[PDB]
Amino acid sequence: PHVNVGTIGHVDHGKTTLTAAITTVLAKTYGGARAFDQIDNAPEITINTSHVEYDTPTRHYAHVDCPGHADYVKNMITGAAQMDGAILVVAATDGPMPQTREHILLGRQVGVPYIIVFLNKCDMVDDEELLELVEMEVRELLSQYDFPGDDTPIVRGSALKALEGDAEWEAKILELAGFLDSYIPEPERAIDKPFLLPIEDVFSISGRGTVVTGRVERGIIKVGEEVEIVGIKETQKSTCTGVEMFRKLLDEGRAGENVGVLLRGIKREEIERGQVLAKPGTIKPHTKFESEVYILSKDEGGRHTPFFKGYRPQFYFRTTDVTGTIELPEGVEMVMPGDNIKMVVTLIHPIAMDDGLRFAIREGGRTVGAGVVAKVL
Numbered sequence: 001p002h003v004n005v006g007t008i009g010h011v012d013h014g015k016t017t018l019t020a021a022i023t024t025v026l027a028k029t030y031g032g033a034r035a036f037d038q039i040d041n042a043p044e045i046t047i048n049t050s051h052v053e054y055d056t057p058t059r060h061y062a063h064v065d066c067p068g069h070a071d072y073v074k075n076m077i078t079g080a081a082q083m084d085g086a087i088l089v090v091a092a093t094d095g096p097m098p099q100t101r102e103h104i105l106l107g108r109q110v111g112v113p114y115i116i117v118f119l120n121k122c123d124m125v126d127d128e129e130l131l132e133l134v135e136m137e138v139r140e141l142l143s144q145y146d147f148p149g150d151d152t153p154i155v156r157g158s159a160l161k162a163l164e165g166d167a168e169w170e171a172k173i174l175e176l177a178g179f180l181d182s183y184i185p186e187p188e189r190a191i192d193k194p195f196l197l198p199i200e201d202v203f204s205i206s207g208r209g210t211v212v213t214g215r216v217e218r219g220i221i222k223v224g225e226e227v228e229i230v231g232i233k234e235t236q237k238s239t240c241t242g243v244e245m246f247r248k249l250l251d252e253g254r255a256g257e258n259v260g261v262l263l264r265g266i267k268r269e270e271i272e273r274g275q276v277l278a279k280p281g282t283i284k285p286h287t288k289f290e291s292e293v294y295i296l297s298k299d300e301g302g303r304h305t306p307f308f309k310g311y312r313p314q315f316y317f318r319t320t321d322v323t324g325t326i327e328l329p330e331g332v333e334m335v336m337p338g339d340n341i342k343m344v345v346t347l348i349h350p351i352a353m354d355d356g357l358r359f360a361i362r363e364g365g366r367t368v369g370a371g372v373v374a375k376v377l
């Protein structure tokens with residue numbers, strides 16, 4: 001029973017120290033352990049990121065911890081962070097800083113579902129009034145970006161004094177680990193999410209209509225069930241006459257399976273690149289949306305010059321490129337390579353969409369950036 005988390009926060013606020021403390025304390029108590037030098041030196045579009053593993057008696061955790069702001073932007077945009085919930089590290093010394101807010105903002109924009117707060121460097125704070133002011137400031141900061149500030153768990157502590165061995169502070173690491181179990185709910189498994197099949201290929205087969213092939217991203221497609229072809233044009237409705245995996249005849253199409261879905265009355269020429277197969281009324285097609293994009297730098301194989309309002313690139317949603325016009329934020333004059341901005345995208349063709357969906361920005365078949373669907377319009 002695996003859950004994905006990460007340490008989010010401002011530079012030097014004690015993110016790496018906390019990650020090491022989490023591994024060591026749960027290792028002394030339940031099982032395992034990693035030290036600062038191991039997590040600070042992060043491996044690996046250059047996203048430097050450490051991937052840590054730790055266990056609770058009830059769950060398994062994959063943890064992400066990055067050296068600087070750049071790697072948090074990159075990981076949240078590119079989806080690679082896979083966070084089911086985040087841990088915001090706030091120092092009681094400094095309090096919410098520029099990157100604290102920017103990490104909460106991006107959290108709202110990339111769809112990080114739950115944020116738990118660890119108030120670090122309490123060993124260095126002697127006034128209680130100071131800690132309550134830093135905690136209120138964080139509660140205020142979370143509720144601004146639609147997070148449940150009043151219902152958010154805020155653990156007071158010292159990642160370093162617990163890392164060193166002081167038993168009083170190891171009790172706060174265990175408190176944190178508890179809220180990672182009680183407060184992050186079990187993520188909904190794909191087989192339970194309504195049916196979604198990105199059309200990867202199409203064929204006109206012998207005496208049995210049209211076959212649509214691809215990988216079932218969510219739920220199940222049962223033979224005889226009504227379906228929808230959402231995307232590039234107006235939504236067409238069909239019926240699943242059959243499900244075929246290679247030469248094996250099936251009646252079910254389960255999530256994570258590469259199948260061939262036989263459709264009724266649908267013709268090879270009515271199927272387009274980028275279209276999907278969905279449970280009726282579970283996914284709608286959109287052209288206009290708010291985005292959170294990261295543009296590749298020269299030393300990342302991206303653009304070597306900036307782009308403006310008149311920029312019109314391709315947006316690789318699931319299976320294909322779709323040209324789109326852009327709307328830059330007020331006061332945003334241009335986008336340099338290596339930049340991170342919000343942008344309103346207007347696609348030529350509608351794509352089946354909901355918030356959280358990722359895309360790649362391209363220019364003549366080469367990736368030049370990456371984005372997230374912040375809000376559909």
Ligand SMILES: Nc1nc2c(ncn2[C@@H]2O[C@H](COP(=O)(O)OP(=O)(O)OP(=O)(O)O)[C@@H](O)[C@H]2O)c(=O)[nH]1
Pocket residue numbers: 009010011012013014015016017018040067120121122123124157158159160161
């Ligand atoms: N007093 C005290 N210092 C701490 C605590 N946690 C971290 N520090 C120190 O704060 C410094 C920076 O903390 P880091 O763990 O490196 O935090 P970071 O967010 O990963 O940032 P970088 O310094 O840029 O790598 C280090 O010298 C830590 O020893 C704490 O609980 N108490």
Ligand SMILES: [Mg+2]
Pocket residue numbers: 015016040066067068
């Ligand atoms: Mg670090």
Ligand code: NA
Pocket residue numbers: 223224240241
């Ligand atoms: Na049938």
Ligand code: NA
Pocket residue numbers: 316317318358359360
């Ligand atoms: Na992509």
